[PDB]
Amino acid sequence: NDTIASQDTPAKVVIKANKLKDLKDYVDDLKTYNNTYSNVVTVAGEDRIETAIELSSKYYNSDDKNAITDKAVNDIVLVGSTSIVDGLVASPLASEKTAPLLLTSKDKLDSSVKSEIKRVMNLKSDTGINTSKKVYLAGGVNSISKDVENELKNMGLKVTRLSGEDRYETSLAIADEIGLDNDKAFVVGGTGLADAMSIAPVASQLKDGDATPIVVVDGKAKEISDDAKSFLGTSDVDIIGGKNSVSKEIEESIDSATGKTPDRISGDDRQATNAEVLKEDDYFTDGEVVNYFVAKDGSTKEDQLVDALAAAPIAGRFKESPAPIILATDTLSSDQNVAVSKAVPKDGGTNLVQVGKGIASSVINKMKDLLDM
Amino acid sequence: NDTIASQDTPAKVVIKANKLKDLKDYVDDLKTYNNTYSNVVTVAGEDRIETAIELSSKYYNSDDKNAITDKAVNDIVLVGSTSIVDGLVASPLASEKTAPLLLTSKDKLDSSVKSEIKRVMNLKSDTGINTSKKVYLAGGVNSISKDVENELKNMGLKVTRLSGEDRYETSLAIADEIGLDNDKAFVVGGTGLADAMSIAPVASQLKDGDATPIVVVDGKAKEISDDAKSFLGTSDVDIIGGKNSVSKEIEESIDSATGKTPDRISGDDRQATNAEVLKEDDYFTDGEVVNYFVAKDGSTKEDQLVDALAAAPIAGRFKESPAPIILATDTLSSDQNVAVSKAVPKDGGTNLVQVGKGIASSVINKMKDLLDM
Amino acid sequence: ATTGTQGYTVVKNDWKKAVKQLQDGLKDNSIGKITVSFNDGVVGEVAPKSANKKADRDAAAEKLYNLVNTQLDKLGDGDYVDFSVDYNLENKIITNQADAEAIVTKLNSLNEKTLIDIATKDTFGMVSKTQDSEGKNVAATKALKVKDVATFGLKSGGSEDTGYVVEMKAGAVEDKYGKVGDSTAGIAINLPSTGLEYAGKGTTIDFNKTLKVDVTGGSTPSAVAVSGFVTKDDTDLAKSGTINVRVINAKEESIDIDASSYTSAENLAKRYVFDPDEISEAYKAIVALQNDGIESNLVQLVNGKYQVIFYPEGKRLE
Amino acid sequence: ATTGTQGYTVVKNDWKKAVKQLQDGLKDNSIGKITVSFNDGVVGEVAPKSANKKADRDAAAEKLYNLVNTQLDKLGDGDYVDFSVDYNLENKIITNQADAEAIVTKLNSLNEKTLIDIATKDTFGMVSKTQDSEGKNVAATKALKVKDVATFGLKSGGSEDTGYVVEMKAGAVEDKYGKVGDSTAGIAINLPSTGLEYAGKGTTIDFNKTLKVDVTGGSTPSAVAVSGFVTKDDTDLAKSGTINVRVINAKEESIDIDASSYTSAENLAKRYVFDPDEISEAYKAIVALQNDGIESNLVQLVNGKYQVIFYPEGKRLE
């Protein structure tokens, strides 16, 4: 007429009530508050560089509940902290290579970043540097200078730079390093920064082990490049962004090259396009999206989307249910509100990760409301 | 799991409670407030004459539960409204003869009293006034004038006057009419007005059918009268009042005459003597006196004890549990407080009758407290 | 009906739902006959021609409503309607296959209730049919729950005419009762051989008594038994007999002592005058129930609350 | 013995009352053995050498107290005492003449409880032994109460060794069971021939079942019987078996939801972290008890209130 209690218990809680319904309600609220007190985390530093380091220390070579990997890594993906354009498609690379996406100042490797590199890769004097310890620089010299590349080389690491003359060839360099073994690829326009960040988590979803590559294409050209065509081969393609980001001409070009009809995920703006990525069934299943990330949208300044870039690999590999990234600085769009409402189960969300500073409180409060948190 | 209710019931009261103890307490309070809202009656008019009439209409030729008689009466006991001294021992007479004790102005029979006489005796033109319709005047001409006696005679009633030159001879005239048939009598002092009123209810107790007579004796004389001696014969006597009312000389005098040792019920004052009458086992049983009367004590004016005089016959015959009269104008004595506490059962009193107007509220509140009312 | 007797007293505002309970009672066969009385005089009898046919039970329920609806809806001050209800809770059936399945689910919600725990060296409980190689009792795989002992479901030959009847089928248990490491062979558990059917038998399944274990013998137990369906009457009156329902032209005063504002027993005494014997008998049944645990018809556990019923004489003066 | 099992969890402050109940349990023979454990290790066995002798039962109770009083009174954080109590509520005798008379008074407080009401033309009840001049049943003088079926008092020959044993003696009744104006002869009231002894038999008398009527026949009755003593266990546990009591070094937090100030379920969550399974199983037993009639060992009516028991993991951070 009681149960036998644990010896370490601080108290014997006897909850009594005159009305079985008032007991029921008390025990129901108790269940709710007990379970509820745990899952809304912020990951941010004073700088965007610190935010990326916070992301690496929390998700790579980490014992954290949602870490992408718990062991030391063999690969880093490094991006110029200012240059969002160059590192734009680097998220799925970071996902498939099991590598943190770090940000560095263009001219000097930040001591904070160097320390995180040694920490996350476990670099030491007593250990041999075989040809497998690698650092990928996603961008040209105007994003990550030669000085920084040499500093990584100086510590004793293989340093490969995934770059080209522009964002397009830079994207293929990155996409080439990534698989394309599931007969599937993503395509984004040169100016579709927020779109690439919207799909970055999805690309970063390992599907039967491999990430899906993202290729940036000249959205106002008559045809995509021969390199894009060769890379894409005979695969299925999903275009992210409207006609102002990737023209109708480019869609046909992809069709003709692959022999397969490409898909299109897009809205009238960046927040709408982000909402659409969430609504798409191939990327997320209705009533099965419990995990969510939030990052700034780039409305105030475009380079502030690096928080999403660094967060996307993690969102793609998050637990056993991939998470999207909701792009919102000061306010959530009505479309994002509806998309999350249809994506989340009737029971609500189980994880919410705010990435970076300057995201207004209304945004987090609203996300908590939609996710019943 | 419910009862079948009366059709005339204004409501279905369903009393529910989660804790059976709170139900128990609610039903217990309900029982208490339900039962307690009913038995504390005042019997008073604007005059002492009206108070006696109110007493007659309530207790004689009345359907009231504590009425001395329910039918028309054959005997009246009339007393001078100012002269308490003359009618002093008339209460047991009124009790045994089944007669109301009325008050009248000395010179003119009050119209209200005349009306009550015709009412209580049922006097009419179509009916013969047989030799049994009687009016006893308890007092001489200076208490009830000849004019008033003749006005009663003019109606066609037999009028017998029980009187003498003083209170003593007047008392024997009254005691003789009562008759000493139980080998028992009561004795009080000439100034023991309050004492006569204290015992009046007791004398008025019919024991084996008969009331017990009360005799007033000269309390400061060396011996009681030959008439008192002759009347008392060989009977048991109970003296009421202290040595200042009936001296030790008079107690011995009674002893010598009767051959039996007289009892004495007394205190240091009138309220104490009243308390003692209640405490006496022959008159009342401990934990068995539930019925009580209250009247003024005569401290402010002696003649105000006429209310007790008129109430005493009633108190003596009240139901089947005789009632005392508590004498108190402005305050109950500490002795009265104790006496009532020991007389009343642990469960409290069942009837409280206030007689007259100028009794302070403190007195009644105190009686209700002592009786748990 | 006669004032003061055992039976239900419905107020005018709830006449429709009370009559619905009688109609439901005729429909489900709890009720074999209803003799109706307007005020003190008998005016009609409602009874299905053949209890076996649905239509006859529905016809009886319609005639009941038609007879009493104006009398009840237009009930004046001092008027009342009495229903003498010949019932036999043993004949009550479930007329809706959805309601029968609702009772099967009521029973299935007990499936996981543990009746006997697994045995230990310290504590008696469930042990295996066969002893180990050394002749000692070994613990059973699972505790004895309700899912072990009986299965539930509606009976095969059910219909709206005969009724759907929830049925329990005694299971089989190879496991026995004892202590682990003990040499005496485990005791056979007697399963339900009676009370295998429940037609919603003018009763509700008493879960304190239904499917309950009774161990006999102590230090060396000698017998274990498990009861079948044991019902409790939805009215405490008896499983068969006649009950009286009375509708009156009175207002319902629900006095919940747990409420924030309710008629204080003082203000209740000030507003109405109550029968002293009605109060005192209810009080005695409450005291006996409180101090000694003694149950009575006068005071009853209904919806997690102990209740008493009072029908005051009238309103108080002033 | 084991965390999470059915049994009592006494807090340190009530160790004395609980141990007094086990002592009383040994004295009255409810308890045949108590295996005592300090933390996880067995340290002693308490058992009367011979159950028929008083001295042996008292020796067992004194040994119990002596063994556990310092361990319980000086119980440190993380420490506990487990009692595995082999009982047989059926072997309980009432070994104190004061306790026996306390139970006889409990039984005597039932004497005025009506078992069967007087019969009417409508309702079955108590009728007279002989029919009227026309061969019809006439109502009985009085209702059938418990005073009419049995008398109570401690057994003659009783002693502290063999025990005082509160005893029922079946009375005699000439009155029978039927309807008034019916020609069929009244049915004999079968009086208690078993369950005549009750020593507070490791239990409390179930008044819902003790001295209760069992009508057989439905719409047409054919037999009526009255039960003797039917008990309900001092514990929710069965009439024979073993109970686990555990004392812990924890403070008792009485959370009464009906109180003016109590720990809100929110602030309770804020002060302690609770085992999710402890909460959800309790919640499921509440839901089942609310929606169906289902009683469970997890949720219990104790002192007019539904209770759940929680043993949180520890305090919450910040």
Short mmCIF file of C-alpha atoms in Angstrom, two decimals, chain A residues 130-324:
data_model
loop_
_atom_site.label_atom_id
_atom_site.label_comp_id
_atom_site.label_asym_id
_atom_site.label_seq_id
_atom_site.Cartn_x
_atom_site.Cartn_y
_atom_site.Cartn_z
CA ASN A 130 50.10 9.50 -41.44
CA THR A 131 48.70 10.80 -44.76
CA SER A 132 45.10 10.69 -43.24
CA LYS A 133 45.15 13.92 -40.97
CA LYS A 134 43.51 16.53 -43.26
CA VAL A 135 42.28 20.17 -43.21
CA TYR A 136 39.95 21.36 -45.94
CA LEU A 137 40.01 25.09 -46.66
CA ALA A 138 36.64 25.88 -48.26
CA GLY A 139 37.49 29.00 -50.25
CA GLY A 140 40.17 30.82 -52.25
CA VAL A 141 42.92 33.17 -50.94
CA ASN A 142 40.50 36.13 -50.51
CA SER A 143 38.55 34.06 -47.90
CA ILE A 144 41.40 32.16 -46.15
CA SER A 145 44.88 33.63 -46.85
CA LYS A 146 48.07 31.67 -47.67
CA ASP A 147 49.50 32.72 -44.25
CA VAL A 148 46.72 30.76 -42.48
CA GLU A 149 47.13 27.70 -44.76
CA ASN A 150 50.88 27.64 -44.05
CA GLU A 151 50.23 27.86 -40.27
CA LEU A 152 48.07 24.68 -40.49
CA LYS A 153 50.78 23.05 -42.69
CA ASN A 154 53.45 24.15 -40.11
CA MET A 155 51.77 22.13 -37.33
CA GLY A 156 52.26 19.01 -39.63
CA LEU A 157 48.84 18.49 -41.29
CA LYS A 158 47.86 17.71 -44.91
CA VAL A 159 46.02 20.91 -46.09
CA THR A 160 43.76 20.66 -49.12
CA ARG A 161 42.07 23.77 -50.41
CA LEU A 162 38.69 23.27 -52.06
CA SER A 163 38.47 26.34 -54.25
CA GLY A 164 38.03 27.72 -57.73
CA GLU A 165 37.97 31.03 -59.65
CA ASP A 166 34.52 31.75 -58.17
CA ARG A 167 31.76 30.39 -55.91
CA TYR A 168 30.71 27.89 -58.64
CA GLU A 169 34.03 26.13 -59.17
CA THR A 170 34.63 26.41 -55.39
CA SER A 171 31.31 24.62 -54.83
CA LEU A 172 32.20 21.76 -57.22
CA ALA A 173 35.60 21.37 -55.56
CA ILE A 174 33.67 20.87 -52.31
CA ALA A 175 30.92 18.70 -53.98
CA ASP A 176 33.63 16.50 -55.68
CA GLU A 177 35.20 15.81 -52.31
CA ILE A 178 31.64 14.74 -51.19
CA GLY A 179 30.23 11.45 -52.71
CA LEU A 180 27.27 11.58 -55.17
CA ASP A 181 26.87 7.78 -54.68
CA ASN A 182 23.09 7.77 -53.93
CA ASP A 183 22.29 8.96 -57.47
CA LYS A 184 21.18 12.36 -55.90
CA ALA A 185 22.49 16.02 -55.76
CA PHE A 186 21.38 19.61 -54.71
CA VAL A 187 21.75 22.79 -56.76
CA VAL A 188 21.69 26.50 -55.57
CA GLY A 189 22.20 29.90 -57.28
CA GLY A 190 25.31 32.13 -56.84
CA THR A 191 23.41 34.70 -54.65
CA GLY A 192 21.22 32.02 -52.92
CA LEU A 193 23.19 32.24 -49.63
CA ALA A 194 20.22 31.77 -47.34
CA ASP A 195 18.90 28.96 -49.67
CA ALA A 196 22.17 27.06 -49.41
CA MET A 197 21.88 27.49 -45.60
CA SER A 198 18.26 26.30 -45.73
CA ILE A 199 19.29 23.06 -47.57
CA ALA A 200 22.68 22.66 -45.87
CA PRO A 201 21.11 20.59 -43.01
CA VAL A 202 19.38 18.30 -45.54
CA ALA A 203 22.47 17.81 -47.66
CA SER A 204 24.20 17.13 -44.38
CA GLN A 205 21.75 14.26 -43.72
CA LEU A 206 23.66 11.10 -44.26
CA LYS A 207 21.38 8.91 -46.36
CA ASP A 208 22.51 5.28 -46.46
CA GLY A 209 25.86 6.63 -44.98
CA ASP A 210 26.71 9.41 -47.58
CA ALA A 211 25.87 13.15 -47.50
CA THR A 212 24.25 14.68 -50.57
CA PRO A 213 26.43 17.25 -52.40
CA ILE A 214 25.36 20.85 -53.10
CA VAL A 215 26.51 22.53 -56.25
CA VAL A 216 26.30 26.27 -56.83
CA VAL A 217 25.53 27.07 -60.50
CA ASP A 218 25.50 30.33 -62.45
CA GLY A 219 21.82 31.11 -62.10
CA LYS A 220 21.77 33.70 -64.95
CA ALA A 221 23.83 31.62 -67.48
CA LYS A 222 22.34 29.68 -70.49
CA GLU A 223 23.97 26.38 -69.36
CA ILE A 224 25.68 24.95 -66.25
CA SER A 225 29.44 24.18 -66.53
CA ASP A 226 30.86 20.95 -68.11
CA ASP A 227 32.40 20.27 -64.67
CA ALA A 228 28.93 20.50 -63.08
CA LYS A 229 27.57 18.22 -65.90
CA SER A 230 30.37 15.62 -65.48
CA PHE A 231 29.98 15.67 -61.68
CA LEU A 232 26.18 15.41 -61.85
CA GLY A 233 26.50 12.52 -64.43
CA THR A 234 23.11 10.71 -64.58
CA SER A 235 21.79 11.73 -61.07
CA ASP A 236 18.51 13.17 -59.67
CA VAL A 237 18.84 16.95 -58.81
CA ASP A 238 16.86 19.17 -56.40
CA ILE A 239 17.16 22.94 -57.13
CA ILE A 240 16.82 25.24 -54.08
CA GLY A 241 15.63 28.87 -54.59
CA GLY A 242 13.38 30.80 -57.00
CA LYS A 243 14.00 31.80 -60.68
CA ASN A 244 15.83 35.00 -59.54
CA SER A 245 18.45 32.68 -57.90
CA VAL A 246 18.50 29.84 -60.55
CA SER A 247 16.88 30.66 -63.94
CA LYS A 248 14.54 28.38 -65.93
CA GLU A 249 17.42 27.96 -68.47
CA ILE A 250 19.65 26.35 -65.83
CA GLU A 251 16.90 23.88 -64.84
CA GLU A 252 16.61 22.67 -68.47
CA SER A 253 20.43 22.41 -68.72
CA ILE A 254 20.48 20.06 -65.67
CA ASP A 255 17.58 18.03 -67.14
CA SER A 256 19.44 17.52 -70.48
CA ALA A 257 22.74 16.58 -68.81
CA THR A 258 21.36 14.07 -66.27
CA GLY A 259 18.55 12.66 -68.43
CA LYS A 260 16.34 12.94 -65.24
CA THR A 261 13.77 15.70 -64.43
CA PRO A 262 15.12 17.97 -61.56
CA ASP A 263 12.93 19.11 -58.58
CA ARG A 264 12.49 22.70 -57.21
CA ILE A 265 12.15 23.84 -53.54
CA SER A 266 11.59 27.65 -53.22
CA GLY A 267 9.62 30.70 -51.89
CA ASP A 268 9.35 34.49 -52.51
CA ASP A 269 12.12 35.21 -49.95
CA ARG A 270 14.71 33.42 -47.81
CA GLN A 271 12.43 32.68 -44.80
CA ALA A 272 9.76 31.23 -47.14
CA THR A 273 12.41 29.07 -48.91
CA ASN A 274 13.55 27.88 -45.47
CA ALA A 275 9.92 26.99 -44.63
CA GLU A 276 9.69 25.04 -47.96
CA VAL A 277 12.80 22.94 -47.19
CA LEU A 278 11.02 21.86 -44.01
CA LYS A 279 7.73 21.11 -45.86
CA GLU A 280 9.55 18.82 -48.42
CA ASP A 281 8.84 15.10 -47.69
CA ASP A 282 12.24 13.75 -48.99
CA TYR A 283 14.04 15.89 -46.41
CA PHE A 284 11.65 15.69 -43.46
CA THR A 285 8.60 13.51 -42.64
CA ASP A 286 5.32 15.12 -41.38
CA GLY A 287 4.77 14.64 -37.67
CA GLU A 288 8.35 13.24 -37.25
CA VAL A 289 10.51 16.44 -36.96
CA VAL A 290 11.31 16.83 -33.27
CA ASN A 291 14.79 18.42 -33.43
CA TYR A 292 15.30 22.07 -34.48
CA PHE A 293 18.10 24.61 -34.96
CA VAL A 294 17.67 28.41 -35.20
CA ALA A 295 20.13 30.87 -36.72
CA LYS A 296 20.08 34.43 -38.07
CA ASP A 297 18.74 34.90 -41.63
CA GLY A 298 21.27 37.45 -43.03
CA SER A 299 18.58 40.21 -43.46
CA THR A 300 20.66 42.67 -41.38
CA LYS A 301 23.98 41.53 -43.07
CA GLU A 302 24.59 38.49 -45.37
CA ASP A 303 27.87 37.30 -43.80
CA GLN A 304 25.95 36.63 -40.50
CA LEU A 305 24.70 33.30 -42.05
CA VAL A 306 28.04 31.63 -41.10
CA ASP A 307 26.35 30.53 -37.86
CA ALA A 308 23.96 28.40 -39.96
CA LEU A 309 26.91 27.11 -42.08
CA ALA A 310 28.73 25.86 -39.01
CA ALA A 311 25.46 24.47 -37.48
CA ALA A 312 24.11 22.66 -40.60
CA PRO A 313 26.40 19.54 -40.50
CA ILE A 314 25.34 19.08 -36.89
CA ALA A 315 21.65 19.62 -37.70
CA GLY A 316 21.91 17.00 -40.50
CA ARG A 317 23.40 14.35 -38.13
CA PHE A 318 21.51 15.39 -35.00
CA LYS A 319 20.43 12.25 -33.04
CA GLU A 320 18.20 9.81 -35.10
CA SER A 321 15.94 12.55 -36.50
CA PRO A 322 17.61 15.21 -38.65
CA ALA A 323 16.94 18.85 -37.79
CA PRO A 324 16.30 21.82 -40.07
#
